[PDB]
Amino acid sequence: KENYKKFYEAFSKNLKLGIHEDSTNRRRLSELLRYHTSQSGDEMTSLSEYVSRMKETQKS
Amino acid sequence: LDIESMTIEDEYSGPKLEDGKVTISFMKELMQWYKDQKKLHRKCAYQILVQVKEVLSKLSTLVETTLKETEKITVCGDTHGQFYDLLNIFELNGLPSETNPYIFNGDFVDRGSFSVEVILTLFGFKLLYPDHFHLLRGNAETDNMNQIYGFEGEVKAKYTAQMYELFS
Ligand SMILES: [Mn+2]
């Protein structure tokens, strides 16, 4: 968790650029992204956590 | 109310610390979590910082206390953010209970080494024995030195920056 944090802060731009340009590895790169959300406060989430917390009525 | 957003972890196996006064049993455990280089969970840490603000902001800017003839006070000075010395005095001169109404002349973020952990325990004890346990500000203590001696970095390493706003 802590080594990833350091990494991400330094190189998140490169990962985001990779999503944009690399048409094949988007599938894996997307799981490396981390974002702040309205229900994580000052912490960040993987997109996969967003999903595990989705309500059964959310379809997006 | 970031505390009531839950997101509890207990990776530390930490007891719940309520908005009521922190139990001495945990405080003893916390001192052991410093013997073991172990840290508090975030919701408890936020909750104590909220309560610490609420009590401290009402205390008089000059503290006034009457020491009865038969009563004795132990007075303490600069600690440079090392808990080891206070670990021992608490164990040596009696734990900082009502029978050990200590006064501490600040200088805890004076240097960073265990300094988060130092104020984090002192601020624990201050809630349990507020009448007996008295904390002053030190003279090496402002954002200017919280930066120079890397305490701001300790906070930003262990926690997201909003924690540093709350500590401020
Ligand atoms: Mn000092």
Polypeptide structure, described:
Chain B: The active site is at 140 (proton donor/acceptor). Chain B: Substrate binds at residues 80, 111, 139-140. Chain B: Belongs to the PPP phosphatase family. PP-5 (PP-T) subfamily. Chain B: Mn(2+) 2 binds at residues 107, 139. The structure is cut from a larger assembly and holds chains A (60 residues) and B (168 residues). Chain A has 60 residues and is mostly helical. Chain A is 50% helix and 7% strand. Chain A has three helices and two strands. Chain A has helices at 2-21, 26-29, 47-52; strands spanning 35-36, 44-45. In chain A, a hairpin with a 7-residue loop joins β1 and β2 (44-45). With 168 residues, chain B is mostly helical. Chain B has seven helices and three strands. Chain B has helices at 24-35, 42-56, 84-92, 115-128, 143-148, 151-158, 162-167, and strands at 75-76, 103-104, 134-135. The longest helix of chain B is centred in the first third of the chain and has 15 residues, at 42-56. Chain B is globular, with a radius of gyration of 16 Å. The interface between A and B is small, with 5 and 8 residues. The complex binds manganese (II) ion. Residues 78, 107, 110, 138-140 of chain B line the site of manganese (II) ion (MN).
- Shape verdict of chain B: globular
Give the N-terminus to C-terminus distance of chain B in angstroms.
18 Å
Name the quaternary structure.
part of a larger assembly
Main sheet strand line-up of chain A: 1-2
Tell me the major beta sheet of chain A.
2 strands, antiparallel
Strand order of the largest sheet of chain B: 1-2-3
Name the helicity range of chain A: 40-55%
Content of β-strand of chain B? under 5%
Gross morphology of chain A is flat
Number of helices, counting only DSSP H or I runs of 4 residues or more of chain B: 7
Q: Give the ordered list of helices and strands of chain B.
A: HHEHEHEHHH
Bound molecule kinds, no repeats: manganese (II) ion
- Secondary structure: number of strands of chain A: 2
Cα(first) to Cα(last) distance of chain A is 27 Å
The total strand number of chain B stands at 3
